[PDB]
Amino acid sequence: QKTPQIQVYSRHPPENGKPNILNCYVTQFHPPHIEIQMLKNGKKIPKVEMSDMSFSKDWSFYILAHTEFTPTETDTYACRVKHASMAEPKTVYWDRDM
């Protein structure tokens, strides 16, 4: 078993109001079975497109999930990941400052 690394980031400079694309990039996990959702305020975002799963030179898997979004001063985006190496589902919030 290897626990997932979750990184959340925007495609373009994250100006409020303007349309942008949010990326949730999961890494360093084994086995390859994994559930990923992207969350807006708590509710699941209906169309989250995903890349195919691949692995790296250390034989650990990585996948990229992404969706279009419009950032707001008040609206919060997150990425939840269920994996066997974890008791509870890990939820990671987008921090534009990070």
Partner: protein
């Protein structure tokens, strides 16, 4: 350029199994082979390389037999391991060639740990492999037919098909996309310290140079981040600098890339541009790290 075909095989129990594949030329995905699909999908227009339809069809049928035979073969060999049938089981396969003269390879991992490889004419166990692998390896090695076509694949077919992909993929392997950079800030884990963050996004090809600067002097505390992908096969990177408060003044993030001529991107902290960029990012800060 390093061509690699990757294979992910999951064996959950006696009945359940799937196997999916992806093919990379450098940092560009060229093929996708889902368990669900009978055929091998193209992700690019040039994914057929220089092969002709008849030559491609033959190879796809070659692989179609392989996928079905592999799944049966593994589920019989799994009966020889210690302890007997240790479900679940993951098998990973990495086969390709590097370009220069060339160098083909085929490596195999079991439960995430690399244990077997093809070498010369046969299958061999790598140093530190489980001793139970000796028996399965002998049976696989007894199969001249497999042995001979794998040889053909690695020695002859990988280099040839790649050399074709490279020629017909040149246009896409040469394209240049400009980085866009923007600045942000976070409190540091140490008291009175703050972490300056320089976001570089949307660049291709992958090689890039990013540093914090006091004009002349590169700031040695610059921590380059990991290369994170974008959905459109571009790249995202960030570089951080830990400063004491009232030391941000006079600092700049510099970015060198092949797509910028010689004209580096320089962003100064507190510069008129930065101020207006920052005013557009504001938010309530929850739930912050």
């Amino acid at each position: 350029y390093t061509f690699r075909c990757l294979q992910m095989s999951s064996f959950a129990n006696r009945s359940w199994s799937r196997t999916d594949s992806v093919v990379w030329l450098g940092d560009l995905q060229t093929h996708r082979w889902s368990n669900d699909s009978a055929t091998i999908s193209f992700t690019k227009p040039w994914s057929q390389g220089k092969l002709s339809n008849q030559q491609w069809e033959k190879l796809q049928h070659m692989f179609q037999v392989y996928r079905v035979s592999f799944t049966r073969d593994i589920q019989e060999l799994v009966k020889m391991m210690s302890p007997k049938e240790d479900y679940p089981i993951e098998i990973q396969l990495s086969a390709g060639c590097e370009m220069y003269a060339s160098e083909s390879f085929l490596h195999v991992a079991f439960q995430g740990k690399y244990v077997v490889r093809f070498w010369g004419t046969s299958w061999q166990t790598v140093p530190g492999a489980p001793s139970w692998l000796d028996l399965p390896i002998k049976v696989l090695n007894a199969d001249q037919g497999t042995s001979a076509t794998v040889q053909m694949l690695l020695n002859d077919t990988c280099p040839l098909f790649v050399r074709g992909l490279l020629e017909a993929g040149k246009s896409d392997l040469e394209k240049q996309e400009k980085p866009v950079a923007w600045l942000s800030s976070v409190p540091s884990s140490a008291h009175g310290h703050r972490q300056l963050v320089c976001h570089v996004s949307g660049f291709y090809p992958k090689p890039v140079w990013v540093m914090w600067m006091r004009g002349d002097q590169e700031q040695q505390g610059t921590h380059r981040g990991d290369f994170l992908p974008n959905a459109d096969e571009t790249w995202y990177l960030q570089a951080t600098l830990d400063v004491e408060a009232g030391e941000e003044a006079g600092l700049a993030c510099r970015v060198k890339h092949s797509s910028l001529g010689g004209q580096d991107i320089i962003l100064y902290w507190g510069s008129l541009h930065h101020i207006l960029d920052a005013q557009k990012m504001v938010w309530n800060h929850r739930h912050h790290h």
